[PDB]
């Protein structure tokens, strides 16, 4: 065994959470959270969740930790539980994620309404006056 690479990744995840949970110099806490997010993305990718890991790493990191850093700058045992068979000539994760439009019409409707309301709410809150 590669000395439990998943276990050491989870350990680095916990260590990073301890790192930014002390909340020193919120830029340093943000950087610790960025490292933790990268490590969690590595965990998900090594597990087999390529699309979900890349969604973490793109959306989470590149958008919202980026916006948090922007706002802050403006201010002052493994390998065992796994499967045996194969998937076919497609990836089950992509098909299941892909199925939301065909199957998850209700989820799409509620999520889109929530996002539009969120835009309206942000503008109203930041309106000022």
């Amino acid at each position: 065994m590669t000395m439990y690479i998943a276990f050491i990744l989870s350990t680095i995840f916990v260590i990073g959470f301890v790192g930014f949970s002390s909340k020193p110099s919120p830029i340093y806490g943000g950087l610790g959270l960025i490292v933790s997010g990268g490590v969690g993305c590595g965990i998900v990718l090594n597990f087999g969740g390529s699309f979900l890991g890349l969604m973490v790493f793109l959306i989470y990191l590149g958008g919202m930790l980026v916006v948090f850093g922007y706002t802050t700058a403006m201010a002052t045992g493994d390998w065992v539980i796994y499967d045996t068979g194969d998937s076919g000539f497609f990836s089950e994760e992509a098909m299941g994620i892909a199925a939301l439009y065909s199957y998850g019409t209700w989820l799409v409707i509620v999520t889109g309404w929530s996002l539009l309301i969120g835009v309206v709410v942000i503008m109203e809150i930041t309106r000022g006056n």
Partner: protein
Amino acid sequence: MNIMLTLLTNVTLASLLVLIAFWLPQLNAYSEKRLPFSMKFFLVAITFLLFDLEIALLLPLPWASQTNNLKTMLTMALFLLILLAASLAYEWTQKGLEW
């Protein structure tokens, strides 16, 4: 294994080059002698974030086109894009995209 090794090689080469650049001129001796917080930048960041969230939902569209339910998938994709357009229109007409 290949991707981790490639990442490690890239980071190692970048680090080696930056440190040699930062220490090559350090061997020879030389002389060696606010508040404003504009609101519009936060708003453009938040708009990018809201738009980014919308982007994730579509991401599965390339795979969504093989379902045998083409009508429902097309309707929901167009609904999502229409709501993204409506968010853009609402922020446009409320002076949310101005400087």
